[PDB]
């Protein structure tokens, strides 16, 4: 309507004065955006989007025409007016992206695109602009974004689409992203803003395609790079400073699990101080509380901790003792158990473990097979089988040569076997924490006999292989590892 008329007038066009008036209208569009936060023109924002597109076109025309490169007569006015108009338009776009607590998709996308084009033209005709716009975006927040409890960190509209079409494509912005947040964390008010918007950086960092990821390449936004590939060590320094500040400031439970997962998978190749992350991981693994949701960070904590031992040989005292402590039915019911059991494989693949350790672990996992869901059962049958396979000095715990009887013996030995079978007791204690001290070698697996008396045909077939003689060694745990209820449904239907 009126915005479209002003757009047409500015496009047809004292042309500088007319453009300034149009820019004043597009800056009063901030008050219009406040009214949109009240009500987006009967919930539509079509006129607002049209005005934003008009402002973008006008900014493009202004960047093509008026500049501050050459100076002569009235150059101060004729350049500074255009520069201030461009700055005011960029500020209006930033404030529209900033104060919009209301979920305005079209307006937010228009603001993001206008900021993109303005940043490009601003480089080419003037990093500081990025400071201002990341301040606007990190002041943006909504309730659907803040404190994601089920999965994910932040369901922002604006900042997340800013990343999925702006951040993961250009490595030059990526270096000027991390290098500014150090300066932004040196600012106290904006540091407090970051620590309040802690999850926004998690939604920014879960995207796997940072500049340190050498597996793929990224294109370039500005046609002139201001030395964005200066040092990979300085890029990792920016990364690690931002991450140490973030981990020290204002954490929570779901974001703790998320940060620890991304710290296992993506952060360590992008990192530089594994001793700092080592102490952070010792705190994350030794964190023991009565909270039923905070009692399960040891899983990926010990995962990343073992990655850190493999990179550099540190130490964790009573290591397999803490393993025996943490092996819980909560691990049977959480969903990180597949990667935890991969960790359990590279844990128990050592050649210095003994009969007591293996008997304790096989027996505890036998009690968990007595009480565990069946996809977890087809996950953990390989461990019993192949671990009994790699250590055959414990195999007596499946059959006793003195307890098996035969007709070709003396009645004296028959009576001796009868009184010993009456004398037999169960000496295993689940409450002893030392696996070397647990006497799990004398106890067989009637729970594995129950697993032979399971209900599912595939689980019963696996336990019938367990009852059959162990003929082979390679079992392909990766194939027999990741199955679910829905996956078993699809497989049995197929």
């Amino acid at each position: 309507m009126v915005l479209l008329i002003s757009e047409i007038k500015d496009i047809a066009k004292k042309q500088y004065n007319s453009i300034i008036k149009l820019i004043n209208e597009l800056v009063i569009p901030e008050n219009v955006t406040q009214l949109e936060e009240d009500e987006t023109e009967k919930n539509l924002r079509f006129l607002v989007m049209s005005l934003f597109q008009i402002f973008r076109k006008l900014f493009s025309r202004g960047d093509l025409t008026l500049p501050s490169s050459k100076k002569s007569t009235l150059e101060k006015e004729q350049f500074v007016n255009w520069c201030r108009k461009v700055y005011e338009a960029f500020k209006t776009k930033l404030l529209a992206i900033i104060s919009d607590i209301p979920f305005e998709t079209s307006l937010g996308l228009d603001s993001l695109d206008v900021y993109l084009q303005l940043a490009e033209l601003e480089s080419t005709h003037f990093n500081k602009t990025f400071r201002k716009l990341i301040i606007a975006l990190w002041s943006s927040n909504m309730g659907e974004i803040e404190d994601v409890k089920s999965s994910g960190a932040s369901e922002n509209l604006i900042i997340v689409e800013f990343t999925e079409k702006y951040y993961t494509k250009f490595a030059d912005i990526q270096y000027y992203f991390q290098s500014e947040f150090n300066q932004l964390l040196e600012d106290p008010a904006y540091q407090d803003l970051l620590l309040k918007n802690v999850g926004k950086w998690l939604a920014l960092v879960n995207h796997d395609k940072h500049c340190s990821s050498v597996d793929a390449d990224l294109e370039i936004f500005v046609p002139n790079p201001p030395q964005a590939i200066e040092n990979e060590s300085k890029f990792k320094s920016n990364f690690e400073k931002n991450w140490l500040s973030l981990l020290n400031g204002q954490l929570s439970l779901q974001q703790y699990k998320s940060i620890l997962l991304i710290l296992h998978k993506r952060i360590i190749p992008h990192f530089h101080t594994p001793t700092k992350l080592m102490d952070f991981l010792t705190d994350s693994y030794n964190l023991q509380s009565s909270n039923k949701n905070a009692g399960v960070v040891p899983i990926l904590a010990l995962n990343g901790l073992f990655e850190l031992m493999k990179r550099f040989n540190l130490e964790y005292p009573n290591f397999y003792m803490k393993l025996y402590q943490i092996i819980n039915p909560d691990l049977m019911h959480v969903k990180y158990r597949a990667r935890f059991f991969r960790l359990m494989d590279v844990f128990l693949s050592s050649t210095h473990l003994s009969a007591h350790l293996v008997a304790s672990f096989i027996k505890k996992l036998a009690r968990l097979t007595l009480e565990s869901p069946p996809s977890a059962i087809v996950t953990v049958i390989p461990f019993i089988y192949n671990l009994i396979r790699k250590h055959p000095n414990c195999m007596i715990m499946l059959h006793n040569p003195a307890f098996i009887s035969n007709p070709f013996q003396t009645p004296d030995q028959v009576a001796n076997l009868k009184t010993l079978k009456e004398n037999y007791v169960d000496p295993f204690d689940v409450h002893e924490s030392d696996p070397e001290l647990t006497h799990a070698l004398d106890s067989s697996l009637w729970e594995l006999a129950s697993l032979m008396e399971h209900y599912h045909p595939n689980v019963a077939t696996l336990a019938k292989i367990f009852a059959q003689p162990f003929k082979k060694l390679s079992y392909n745990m990766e194939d027999f590892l990741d199955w679910n209820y829905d996956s078993l449904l699809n497989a049995e239907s197929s």
């Binding site: 140490l244 981990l247 020290n248 001793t275 700092k276 080592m278 102490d279 952070f280 010792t282 540190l314 130490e315």
Partner: protein, 68 residues
């Protein structure tokens, strides 16, 4: 909160000059405070012996070590 405490304890239980210099490269005073807070007393005593020793060996190192 981001200390290096377990690493200080491991190195001062089992002396390695490489771990000593690699953890001594830090200079952040909050890390210094939190480490010596969650540090053992006798381990801190032998650490201060080692600190005087390394200050005397390379006095140029004593700059960031004068605050430790």
């Amino acid at each position: 909160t981001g200390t290096v405490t377990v690493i200080l304890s491991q190195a001062l239980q089992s002396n390695d000059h490489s771990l000593l210099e690699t953890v001594l490269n830090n200079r952040d005073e909050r890390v210094i405070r939190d480490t010596i807070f969650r540090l053992k007393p006798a381990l801190a005593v032998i650490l201060l012996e080692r600190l005087a020793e390394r200050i005397a060996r390379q006095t140029h190192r004593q700059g960031p070590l004068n605050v430790w």
